[PDB]
Design a protein around this ligand. Structure first.
Ligand SMILES: [Mg+2]
Ligand SMILES: [Mg+2]
Ligand SMILES: [Zn+2]
Lengths: 1114, 15, 222, 83, 263, 40, 105, 94
DNA sequence: GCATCCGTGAGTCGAGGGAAGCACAATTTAACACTTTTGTCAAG
DNA sequence: CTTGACAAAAGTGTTAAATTGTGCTATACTGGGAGCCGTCACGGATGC
């Protein structure tokens, strides 16, 4: 099956490593490989150098270096034993006694740092996790227009999140500039005076703009001493505290000049210098040296504000949503921020413990308590909003999860407090954030994806590649440039025609600050690398994307992440070209390190003899269960004695076919209505798909039970469960756990456990019953684990963890934990959800036998029938073009690569269809078959529809239809042709993770809530359906007083009514009249707890007791 | 500080 | 002492009570300054208040001292082994009379209860209390089967004699709710203790014979 | 006087329906001080107490209808008029 | 203060708020008996006032009281009765109910306007008490307790159970519900047709009223129990009886996309 | 809903609220659309 | 008996609040950390809010409905249904009056 | 649609009164084991079972069919509530 | 008029998510016999 | 139907051992510490 490739755009650089946003950031933070003396001041190394040294103010604790050890357990063990994959962290600290002048050095164990796997995820408590990158406002100095008063601007100084307060500079109507800090406003002259600024010094700089300086030249404080001004400023900031120079200086110094409390950041400092045209010595607003405060950024900030207000040509306002003003905090920066938080708490303990207790006889080990640091790290990786349960339904699911950019989380927007501005597609998103990929709903625009070619630079700004164009000739020099730098050039389009390397078009479509323009070749300065850089990885996997409406292409890319791996998965017939790279960069497959020969091939491992002679064995992940239950296994793709070159595929991972991403099947599709089973997005499929195991997936479920020590006695996992016949215990082994390979259905025992019964005298009726039968009650009860309703499969694995096992960190009181893995092979069924890459999704509503499906004249039935009514409203015409190319490839036995926005066109598709007709119809002529009578009837109607040319021969008119993608389709039930030619083709359809098997749920009675006594919620809890307010309104509007009353009392929380209703039904009687619900009784008692006398009265105003006399004091 | 019980107490003991 | 279960103002008020005690017991004859002696009582009151008010389920003072010492011992072993010590390391560190079983029991005792209103998930619409069933009140199935059993037993005892049925309904506590001893039952009917044991044994035997002929009561026995 | 839907609903005469809509603290504090009595006129008040709503089959207009056949009706009338 | 299955203890935030008030009340009594200075007594009285505030309405005045080791405010009596998660809107105006199911919906073109396709296994659980009586009426089970055991294990269910279930649901109706319930036509009563599978079959003509297509939608199933509930559902709420729109009076069950195209 | 005189006992208040608010999602949002109805 | 036709809400006086209560809560103790039983005079006291299990006193001397409506002398726990524990209220006697925040803020 | 629903709606002034009449009649049929039915033996509802045609167990179906016949009398203040039950018990002991 | 404080923002589902010690007096609990009370056995 | 002896179970001290509650420590020490902006936007109600 040869692959035909379309397109003329030649990409000069390949896609960057797709996970480098995760992998690179964490390596920079840890710096675990650079020798300690070569480590740079970034990551956790910068965190150590900031908090340390710690000074008592006569003891100084110093930091020399840190190191990371080998992880205690491998990744596989951590998952199996519910551990965290981490490396011990040791800091080499030296304690110095200033008085005596002695240094004592020792290496202190600071804790464990979670390690990042090779793919870019973490194993926190045995579960894979992904730290989602966060996008926020870049630190720096920004000048925005005042909305209330036109002609007035506000200057804002924004530090790193939780690294200082925001500073706002405003020009009051009175003419006095005010500085607002911590919601407190005051005149900047007082603060500006504290920085040693006199009357003439300001006039030398800010006096050349107009009357604005007049409001900043108050002599009421200019003559005032800076020390007095500092005390005055301290009183304004926090009033009430006893004013003192030692207290006032400490508050002011730490407010704007303390590097351990105020941090403008590397990005903030870089932005400030680029905007104000200055050079910051550090990353603080002011510097405290020589016992006096030195200004760093306040003066240039005020110079810019006045000049901007005056109207100087070179000063402009700032667009806060501009992608050059927004930066990305990757996993490394997010982790380091929490590391600094915990390391600051560790410094606090050292300071407070080095001044109390054997001051002379102190060592760094005694002073350092690492508990605060570990808690900060473990909290981030577990209870953080950006630390998310990894999505690994298929290899593409986890690749997308790592490239997602979230505006939410600690220090970000709120899902409800975010407006339209933050959710819009900014012009600077071009080439940095995908414009289509986003969650539709409440999170639309708040969670996005990194573009394919984009990479986050060191400061956190997304850069995208552009080709250098000089003299009208496009060079191969690629320049990565941020949004702010990209605004200075005219950037052409990747589709601009070129005669070699020179731009051939006389008029070139370009962008100037996001505005499309028509320019000549001599006016062009940069060119796009390729159309792929505008979209994410998911959206680059949609062929014919230029023909799909963006609202539907959003669904098409999001659904690819939910497709389940299939045992017979196939790569699409029409691909875009990223299929091989997605599989390669997901690390789910296995490739040869270098040239060699395969020595042993097996279902469990592969052994390769490399040319250097070393033997490498590669175990294969077999029937492993992902976070979402899908089975992830690698299948060997080589044979013993096969020579493999470097990078050659050795084993396919989940959802890959010979190294190509295979998220579904290639099926024969007919686009036509069918007896109402296509109605409103429903899908009709053939029984032939099931027969050959198409859309069959393997899913694994994990069941866990525990044996605990109890006051009444210990829970025992045993095969001798009381009052159980031999049928129920047939599949359990002698240890009480179900044997491997056993088929288990709902109600079957997985692990047999017995618990001691709490001593309670039996009811008299039960005591009489036992006496009649002469049976002594047992002291233990059945508390074993059974298969829940709607579940089952084949037992494939049992894991038994016991107290005292190496690495088994069980909870106190837990004797052992037994885990059972049940695997089921799921075939396609009615209610399962199918989708294609172009946003077309639906549920299987009918599975027809093969003899009922429409078939081609050669006898080939179609596989799926799709309703044409889904296209016109959705405007997703890519699926039609894919179907046409699939039909041509079905008869030519080949596959195609059509890159998005540069690929197959209808003139090129129709030449392929002309070839496919010769094999499709030329075969028939040789076999001795002409044109059917039934085909002639359809041709007569087609010429009346204007589909074929009158006067042509039947064969000529059949070819005219074929070039339109239409064939004469016969009806499998009647045998007569469909009255019109039908669009039949081959389409790539994915089976999504949403299956009716995991969603059907019913309940009669079950668990009830503690306080309100209403049914619990959720299928896992066997809970009831929520009859919310809106559902109650519908019954009220219907006039169903008695139906409504039942749901409120008898079926929800009327404890007496629900007990009597159930007993009435099983006796063949009608349910009784309901009574007061238990939720109203709770409300009355809760109102009484507020000191409110709520009383229910009767027609005569006399009190009525709704508590049955149980709460009345005699 | 009226809204801050601790500052209010510290002020009282400072008298 | 902040961050140990009590707020700053609660610590101050407990400290003030220690300061009141120091004033009463202080002796100026010794010529020691007041803060020297009052600091003992202020710390003593603050520390005791934590041991008595910092936990929802109060743990005695001696058990709090054991728990604090156990936590201190584990942290020192943790910093020296480069890993969390096992219960054997901690037990050996604590001293004589300590084993791994006791260490595990102490850690289980020192577990704070978890709030029923703790949110789960990003959305603030789900809590712990929404997943905890009420297992005190009988369910509709349990209540119905209890009434079915009583209804069938009432018919079964109907086949018995007028007195024999009454004897069983008393000896098994089916009337007053509580069992009546042979002598206690005998006073009701004025018959000897030994006689009642005979009729009750005979009446009970007859009920067995009927059940074998119908098997209408064996299901309720599990 | 003209007022909006929110203000018109919050100033209703039933504290049960008003307390379950908005401003529960304000609605209940005013209801408690006045000693307000809820007559259970609307639909929300009855739904809260688990009663039969005064609409549809729960309306007094239709709620007391009686159905009886001819044979029993004659027996009742014959058994009463004879005396 | 309940003990979870694992042995751990779970408690409500009211116990913490009550303990603070009792701890501060008791301390004030001790200080008053000790003749403490007015500064100490005033601080305790001010704290006791704030402890009552936090219990009655946490966060209304000043900083909210939080549980030590966390930043989550404690839930007070006012928070219990107020808000979208309060007693009124969460437990009184709406409830979770028994005899209710849920599943994915697929299109049933063969159904009548008043019929729905209810899966057999959903119907078994929804109508369980009725089924146990019918099993006991026949020879399937000796009594209701024996019959209930049979249904507990899937492999223990005989083929006569399904015949009895077909008798239990005869004439009865169920309520199909799709959220959001914008108007009253978002709940409708249908006569179930027991079907093999796990998805509910919905008539094409009621999809516009439900606003339900078949790209993954799910619906809830509710069983009215008494004779009034069945009479009301079969008379007023039946799908075949609600053919016009209550808002405009125009047909609401009428030919739709594929039907219009064929005609 | 029945093209006949309303029957005594119908909850016309709930029907009125449901009829008005149901097409609310079809009103424009961008003094026009849903915001115009809310201020009215 | 009679049907509920109205619901009235009013302020509760200190006298009425004391008539509701079955006893004063004097200790912040909830349950014993070892036996896990309610503590005397605490927030979960059985002598105030009722027995934890039906017709069974804390001292374990009465364990049947025969002694319905009785109060044990050894422990003081009434022998009744444990559902009363959802309806029976206690009270705290404040050392000084405290304003209701609803009628202030 | 229920059979004869158009005729049933036309027998009452309010549609909710028909639900009350049918729901109350169905309970009378259930309480007396369908022995008080005003339907002739050839008019009784039947259900198709595997063994054969048996009487319909759904009492709401019986009530609706009886109402269409016109042999039932409904209204308000027909007979005392207490006296009606006593008389029905005598005629159709259960 | 402006300035300030408060309450409001759709539904259903879903997995996932659960830092001192010691000395001593008092009080509660567990062991150990030893004493009536209860169920039985064989008789008459 | 009723005794007479019979061993076990339930009940009543009595006492030593765990368990828990309370008091005390004497160099001098004397006013916290966290935070901090995409601060959410609008309309109502009150205090001026
Ligand atoms: Mg979503
Ligand atoms: Mg849909
Ligand atoms: Zn007692």
């Amino acid at each position: 099956m040869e692959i035909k490739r379309f397109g003329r755009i030649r990409e000069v650089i390949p896609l960057p490593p797709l996970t480098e946003i995760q992998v690179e950031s964490y390596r920079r933070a840890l710096q675990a490989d650079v020798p300690p003396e070569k480590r740079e001041n970034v990551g956790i190394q910068a965190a150590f150098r900031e908090t340390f040294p710690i000074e008592e103010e006569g003891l100084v604790l110093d930091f020399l270096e840190y190191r990371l050890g080998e992880p205690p357990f491998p990744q596989d063990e951590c998952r199996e034993k519910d551990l965290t994959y981490q490396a011990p962290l040791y800091a080499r600290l030296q304690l110095i006694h200033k008085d005596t002048g002695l240094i004592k050095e020792d290496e202190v164990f600071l804790g464990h740092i979670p390690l990042m796997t090779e793919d870019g995820s973490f194993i926190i408590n045995g579960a894979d996790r992904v730290i989602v990158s966060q996008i926020h406002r870049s630190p720096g100095v920004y000048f925005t227009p005042d909305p209330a008063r036109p002609g007035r601007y506000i200057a804002s100084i924004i530090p790193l999140p939780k690294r200082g307060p925001w500073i706002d500079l405003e020009v009051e109507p009175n003419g006095v500039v005010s500085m607002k800090v911590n919601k407190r406003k005051f005149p900047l002259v007082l603060l500006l005076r504290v920085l040693g600024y006199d009357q003439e010094t300001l006039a030398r700089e800010l006096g050349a703009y107009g009357e604005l300086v007049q409001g900043l030249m108050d002599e009421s404080v200019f003559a005032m001493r800076p020390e007095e001004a500092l005390i005055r400023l301290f009183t304004l900031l926090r009033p009430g505290d006893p004013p003192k120079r030692d207290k006032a200086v400490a508050y002011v110094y730490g407010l704007i000049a303390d590097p351990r409390r105020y941090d403008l950041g590397e990005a903030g400092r870089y932005k400030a210098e680029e905007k104000l045209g200055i050079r910051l010595s550090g990353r603080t607003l002011a510097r405290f040296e020589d016992g006096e405060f030195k200004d760093e950024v306040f003066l240039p900030t005020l110079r810019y504000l006045f000049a901007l207000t005056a109207g100087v040509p070179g000063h402009e306002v700032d667009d806060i949503d501009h992608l050059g003003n927004r930066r990305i905090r990757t996993v490394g920066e997010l982790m380091t921020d929490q590391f600094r938080v915990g390391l600051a708490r560790l410094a606090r303990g050292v300071r407070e413990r080095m001044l109390m207790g054997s001051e002379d006889s102190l060592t760094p080990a005694k002073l350092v308590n690492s508990r605060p640091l570990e808690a900060a790290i473990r909290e981030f990786f577990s209870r953080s909003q950006l630390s998310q349960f990894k999505d690994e339904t298929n290899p593409l699911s986890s690749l997308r999860h790592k490239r997602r950019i979230s505006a939410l989380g600690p220090g970000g927007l709120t899902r409800e407090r975010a407006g339209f501005d933050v959710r819009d597609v900014h012009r600077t998103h071009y080439g940095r954030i995908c414009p289509v990929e986003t969650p539709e709903g409440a999170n639309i625009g708040l969670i996005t994806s990194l573009a394919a070619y984009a990479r986050v630079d060191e400061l956190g700004f997304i850069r995208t590649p552009y080709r250098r164009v000089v003299g009208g000739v496009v060079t191969d020099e690629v320049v990565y440039m941020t949004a702010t730098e990209e605004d200075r050039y005219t950037i052409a389009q990747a589709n601009t025609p070129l005669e070699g390397n020179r731009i051939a078009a006389e008029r070139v479509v370009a962008r100037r600050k996001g505005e499309p323009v028509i320019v000549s070749p001599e006016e062009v300065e940069f060119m796009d690398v390729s159309p792929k850089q505008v979209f994410s990885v998911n959206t680059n996997l949609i062929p014919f994307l230029e023909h799909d409406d963006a609202n539907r292409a959003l669904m098409g890319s999001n659904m690819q992440t939910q497709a389940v791996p299939l045992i017979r998965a196939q790569a699409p017939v029409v691909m875009t070209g990223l299929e091989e790279r997605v599989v390669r960069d997901s690390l789910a497959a296995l490739y040869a390190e270098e040239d060699g020969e395969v020595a042993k091939v097996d279902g469990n491992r592969i052994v390769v003899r490399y040319e250097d002679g070393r033997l490498v064995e590669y175990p294969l992940r077999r029937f492993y269960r992902s976070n979402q239950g899908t089975a992830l296994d690698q299948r060997p793709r080589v044979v013993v004695g096969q020579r493999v070159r470097k990078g050659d595929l050795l084993a396919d991972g989940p959802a890959s076919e010979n190294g190509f991403l295979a998220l579904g099947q290639n099926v024969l599709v007919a686009i036509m209505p069918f007896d109402g089973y296509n109605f409103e997005d429903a899908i009709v499929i053939s029984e032939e798909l099931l027969k050959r195991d198409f859309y069959t997936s393997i899913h694994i479920e994990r069941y866990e039970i525990e044996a605990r020590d109890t006051k009444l006695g210990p829970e025992r996992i045993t095969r001798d469960i009381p009052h159980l016949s031999e049928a129920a215990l047939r599949d359990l082994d002698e240890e009480g756990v179900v044997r491997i390979g056993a088929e288990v259905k709902p109600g079957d025992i997985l692990v047999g456990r017995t618990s001691f019964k709490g001593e309670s005298e039996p009811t008299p009726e039960e005591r009489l019953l036992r006496s009649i039968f002469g049976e002594k009650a047992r002291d233990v009860k059945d508390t074993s684990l059974r298969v829940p309703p709607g579940e089952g499969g084949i037992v494939v694995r049992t894991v038994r963890l016991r107290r005292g096992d190496p690495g088994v960190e069980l909870k106190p009181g837990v004797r052992e934990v037994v885990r059972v893995y049940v695997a089921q092979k799921r075939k396609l069924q009615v209610g399962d959800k199918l989708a294609n890459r172009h946003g077309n999704k639906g549920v299987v509503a009918k599975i027809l036998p093969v003899e009922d499906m429409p078939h081609l004249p050669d006898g080939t039935p179609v596989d799926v029938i799709l309703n044409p009514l889904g296209v016109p409203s959705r405007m997703n015409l890519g699926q039609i073009l894919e179907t046409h190319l699939g039909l041509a490839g079905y008869f030519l036995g080949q596959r195609y690569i059509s890159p998005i926005f540069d690929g197959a066109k209808e003139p090129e598709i129709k030449e392929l269809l002309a070839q496919a007709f010769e094999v499709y119809f030329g075969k028939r002529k040789g076999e001795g078959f002409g044109v059917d009578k039934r085909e002639v009837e359809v041709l007569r109607r087609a010429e009346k529809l204007g589909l074929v040319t009158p006067g042509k021969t039947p064969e000529e008119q059949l070819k005219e239809l074929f070039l339109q993608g239409k064939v004469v389709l016969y009806d499998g039930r009647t045998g007569e042709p469909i009255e019109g030619p039908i669009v039949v083709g081959q389409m790539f359809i994915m089976k999504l993770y949403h299956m009716v098997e995991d969603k059907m749920h019913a309940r009669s009675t079950g668990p009830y809530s503690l306080i309100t006594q209403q049914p619990l919620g959720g299928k896992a809890q066997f809970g009831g359906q929520r009859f919310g307010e809106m559902e109650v309104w519908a019954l009220e509007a219907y006039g169903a007083a008695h139906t409504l009353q039942e749901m409120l009392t008898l079926k929800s929380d009327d404890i007496e009514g629900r007990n009597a209703a159930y007993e009435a039904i099983i006796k063949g009687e009608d349910v009784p009249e309901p009574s007061v619900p238990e939720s109203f009784r709770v409300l009355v008692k809760e109102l009484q707890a507020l000191a409110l006398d709520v009383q229910t009265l009767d027609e005569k105003d006399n009190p009525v007791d709704i508590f049955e006399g149980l709460a009345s004091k005699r | 500080s009226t809204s801050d019980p601790v500052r209010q107490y510290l002020h009282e003991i400072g008298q | 002492y902040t961050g140990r279960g009590l707020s700053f103002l609660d610590l101050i008020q407990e400290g003030n009570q220690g300061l009141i005690r120091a004033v009463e017991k202080f002796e100026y004859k010794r010529r020691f300054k007041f803060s020297t002696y009052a600091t003992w009582w202020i710390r003593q009151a603050i520390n005791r208040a934590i041991a008595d008010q910092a936990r929802t389920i109060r743990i005695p003072v001696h058990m709090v001292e054991t728990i604090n010492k156990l936590s201190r011992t584990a942290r020192q072993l943790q910093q020296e082994l480069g890993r969390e010590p096992t219960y054997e390391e901690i037990a050996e560190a604590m001293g004589p009379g300590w084993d791994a079983k006791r260490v595990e029991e102490t850690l289980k005792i020192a577990q704070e209860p978890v709030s029923l209103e703790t949110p789960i998930g990003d959305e603030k619409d789900s809590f712990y209390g929404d997943f905890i069933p009420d297992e005190h009140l009988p369910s509709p199935v349990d209540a119905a089967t209890q009434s079915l059993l009583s209804e069938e037993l009432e018919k079964a005892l109907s086949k018995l004699s007028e007195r024999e049925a009454m004897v069983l309904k008393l000896r098994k506590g089916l009337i007053d709710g509580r069992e009546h001893t042979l002598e206690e039952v005998g006073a009701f009917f004025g018959v000897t203790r030994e006689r009642i044991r005979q009729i009750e044994n005979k009446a009970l035997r007859k009920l067995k014979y009927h059940e074998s002929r119908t098997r209408k009561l064996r299901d309720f026995l599990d | 006087l003209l007022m909006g839907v929110t203000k018109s609903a919050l100033s209703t005469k039933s504290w049960l329906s008003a307390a379950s809509f908005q401003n529960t603290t304000h609605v209940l504090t005013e209801a408690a001080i006045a000693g307000k009595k809820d007559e259970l006129i609307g639909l929300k008040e009855n739904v809260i107490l688990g009663r039969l709503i005064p609409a549809g089959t729960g309306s007094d207009f239709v709620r007391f209808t009686q159905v009886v056949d001819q044979k029993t009706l004659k027996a009742i009338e014959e058994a009463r008029k004879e005396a | 203060m309940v003990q979870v299955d694992g042995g751990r203890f779970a408690t409500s935030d009211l116990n913490d708020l009550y303990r603070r008030l009792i701890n501060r009340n008791n301390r004030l009594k001790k200080l008053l008996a000790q003749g403490a200075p007015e500064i100490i007594i005033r601080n305790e009285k001010r704290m006791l006032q704030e402890a009552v505030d936090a219990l009655l309405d946490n966060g209304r005045r000043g900083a909210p009281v939080t549980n030590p080791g966390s930043d989550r405010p404690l839930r007070s009596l006012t928070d219990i009765l107020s808000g979208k998660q309060g007693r009124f809107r969460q437990n009184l105006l709406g409830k979770r109910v028994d005899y209710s199911g849920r599943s994915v919906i697929v299109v049933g073109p063969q159904l009548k306007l008043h019929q729905c396709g209810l899966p057999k296994r959903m119907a078994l659980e929804l109508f369980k008490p009725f089924l146990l009586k019918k099993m006991e009426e026949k020879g399937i089970a000796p009594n209701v307790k024996a019959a209930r055991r049979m249904l507990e294990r899937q492999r223990d269910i005989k083929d006569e159970v399904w015949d009895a279930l077909e008798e239990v649901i005869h004439g009865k109706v169920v309520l199909l519900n799709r959220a959001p319930t914008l108007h009253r036509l978002g709940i409708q009563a249908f006569q179930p047709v027991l079907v093999e599978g796990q998805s509910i079959q919905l008539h094409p003509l009621v999809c516009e009223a439900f606003n339900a297509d078949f790209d993954g939608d799910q619906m809830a199933v509710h069983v009215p129990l008494s004779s009034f509930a069945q009479a009301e559902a079969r008379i007023q709420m039946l799908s075949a009886h609600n053919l016009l729109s209550p808002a405009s009076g125009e047909p609401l069950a009428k030919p739709s996309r594929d039907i219009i195209l064929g005609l | 809903s029945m093209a006949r005189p309303v029957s005594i006992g119908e909850a016309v208040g709930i029907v009125a609220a449901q009829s008005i608010g149901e097409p609310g999602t079809q009103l424009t949002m961008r003094t026009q659309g849903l915001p115009r109805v809310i201020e009215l | 008996k009679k049907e509920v036709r109205k619901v009235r809400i009013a302020l509760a006086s200190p006298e009425k609040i004391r008539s509701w209560s079955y006893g004063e809560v004097e200790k912040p103790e909830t349950i014993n950390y070892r036996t896990l039983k309610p503590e005397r005079d605490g927030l979960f006291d059985e002598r105030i809010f009722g027995p934890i299990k039906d017709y069974e006193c804390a001292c374990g001397k009465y364990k049947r409905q025969r002694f319905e409506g009785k109060v044990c002398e050894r422990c003081g726990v009434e022998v009744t249904k444990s559902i009363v524990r959802r309806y029976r209220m206690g009270h705290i006697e404040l050392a000084t009056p405290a304003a209701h925040i609803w009628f202030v803020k | 649609a229920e059979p004869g629903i158009d005729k049933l709606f036309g027998m009452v002034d309010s549609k909710y009164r028909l639900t009350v009449v049918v729901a109350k009649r169905a309970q009378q049929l259930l309480r007396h084991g369908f022995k008080n039915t005003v339907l002739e033996p050839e008019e009784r509802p039947k259900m198709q079972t595997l063994e054969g045609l048996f009487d319909d167990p759904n009492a709401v179906t019986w009530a609706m069919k009886e109402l269409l016949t016109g042999r039932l009398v409904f209204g308000e203040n027909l007979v005392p509530e207490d006296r009606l039950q006593k008389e029905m018990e005598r005629l159709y002991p259960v």
